Amino acid sequence: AVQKVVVHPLVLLSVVDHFNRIGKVGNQKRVVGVLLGSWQKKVLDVSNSFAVPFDEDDKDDSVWFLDHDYLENMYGMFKKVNARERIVGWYHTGPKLHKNDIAINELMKRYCPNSVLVIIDVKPKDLGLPTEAYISVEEVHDDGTPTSKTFEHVTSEIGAEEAEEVGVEHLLRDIKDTTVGTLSQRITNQVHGLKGLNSKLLDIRSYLEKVATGKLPINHQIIYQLQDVFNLLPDVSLQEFVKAFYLKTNDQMVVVYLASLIRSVVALHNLINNKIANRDAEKKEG
Amino acid sequence: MVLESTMVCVDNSEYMRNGDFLPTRLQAQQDAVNIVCHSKTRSNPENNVGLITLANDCEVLTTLTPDTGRILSKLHTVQPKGKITFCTGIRVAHLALKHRQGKNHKMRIIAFVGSPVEDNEKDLVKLAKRLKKEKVNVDIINFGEEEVNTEKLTAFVNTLNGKDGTGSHLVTVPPGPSLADALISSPILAG
């Protein structure tokens, strides 16, 4: 079915520009619309969409309505201009999901066998690659609950297209690209420890909270399982590198050797040729 | 003619699966939808009528429209199975009424409750006075079986309108064999 989704900045903006539409008139809830997907393969892609007036009451927390006269005839519009573009699901800006979201997908399953919902974010904050994606399946449960319909997270990734980077990538103009090979990889390293070890502390504090409160989630078992896959090397005191010690510097063996060999001859190219051309102009002029 | 948008709420609760309303509440409430939809046709063409499933979770597959053709199609294979939920079904018509393009149509709701609901008298009076602030006049018609000589829904109807406001009126359905056309006789005469 649906494994991963591809969200373009163009269709994501179609949720963002509608945040100006109903944001000025208010009032409650969020921006919600129906998603037009482009499915060429198991990997899902999204090009365009259409935003529909939508509201969700608080009291009355289970009340939701799409406008389906907007959904029907406007489909024949986008279908007439683009035959490949069709509705794969819906979307909204979240930020989180209330329990009522179970009924939005099951209603529109007449349009698509499986409707994928995309939670987006109009204001970028944290922690990383934004928005979100969910898929609607039924896993029931191990405890014996009646059949449980819970949306499972779908990994979301941004993607590009020809001719769409004209105006999009133009307006920024302030970015330095990249530079690959010097700063590009090292800034990630400073962040790879930051973003790597912050979720380490956020989860290890919530995993300690388990014993305290919030149990379940037990989880189970996914938590410790892949944590023990992380445990191929801990790495703890001290590094257990006795076999990887001589191999540590042995990987730095040729990297330092070439860096010593290149800088020697690069100098011979830089130093000699500079002295030659310099004294040819300098002393022959005066 | 009176201007308003009448949102009829079909009852999918598990207690609608018997035949006390002849021949069966599925076809009886169908005939109960037949008489209200054909009456609005005799009343005003501009009145648009949708349908909503109260039990389980509220979902509307038919956009609010004056044509009852799609409504009569959804009356078949409705599968009345689920737990009745009332409180969420009051504003469920009001939210579709807030999506109305024309604002000249009054807000009117008719819901079918055929199952006993667990509710506190304080919960129904808060929704009552909430509709007073929203001016919505909701005509409820008791169906199925419920608390004998229904109190809650009666207090929900009584406290919903006042001075006059002509209005919201509840008609208690007798637990006896009858045709669905004979049930609506009093409510359709005087709402």
Based on Cα principal axes, name the global outline of chain B.
globular
Number of helices of chain A: 7
Number of strands of chain B: 6
Largest sheet of chain B: 4 strands, parallel
**Which outline of chain A best applies?**
extended
- What is the gyration radius of chain A calculated from CA atoms? 28 Å
N- to C-terminal separation of chain B? 16 Å
Number of helices of chain B: 7
In what range is the share of β-strand residues of chain B? Answer: 5-15%
PDB class: hydrolase
Keywords: 26S proteasome, ATP-dependent protease, AAA-ATPase, peptide-unfolding channel, 20S core particle, hydrolase
Entry title: Nucleotide-driven Triple-state Remodeling of the AAA-ATPase Channel in the Activated Human 26S Proteasome
Chain A: 26S proteasome non-ATPase regulatory subunit 7
General description of the model:
This is part of a larger assembly, with chains A (286 residues) and B (191 residues). Helices cover 44% and strands 17% of the residues of chain A. Chain A is of the alpha/beta class. Chain A is extended, with a radius of gyration of 28 Å. Chain B has 191 residues and is α/β, with parallel strands linked by helices. Chain B contains seven helices and six strands. In chain B, the strands form two sheets. A four-stranded parallel sheet of chain B has the order 3-1-4-5, covered by helices on one side. In chain B, helix 4 (121-134) runs parallel beside helix 5 (152-158). Chain B is globular. At the A-B interface, strand 5 and helix 3 of A face helix 3 of B.
Topology:
The structure is cut from a larger assembly and holds chains A (286 residues) and B (191 residues).
Chain A lengths: L3 E4 L1 H17 L6 E8 L4 E8 L3 E2 L7 E2 L2 H14 L4 E7 L9 H7 L7 E4 L14 E5 L10 E5 L1 E4 L6 H8 L10 H30 L9 H8 L15 H41 L1
Parallel strand pairs in A: 1-3, 1-10, 6-7
Antiparallel strand pairs in A: 2-3, 2-6, 4-5, 8-9
Chain B lengths: L3 E7 L10 E2 L2 H19 L7 E3 L15 H6 L16 H8 L7 E8 L7 H14 L2 E6 L9 H7 L19 E2 H4 L1 H5 L2
Parallel strand pairs in B: 1-3, 1-4, 2-6, 4-5
Helix pairs in contact in B: 4-5
Protein name (chain A): 26S proteasome non-ATPase regulatory subunit 7
Family (chain A): Belongs to the peptidase M67A family.
GO molecular function, one term (chain A): protein homodimerization activity
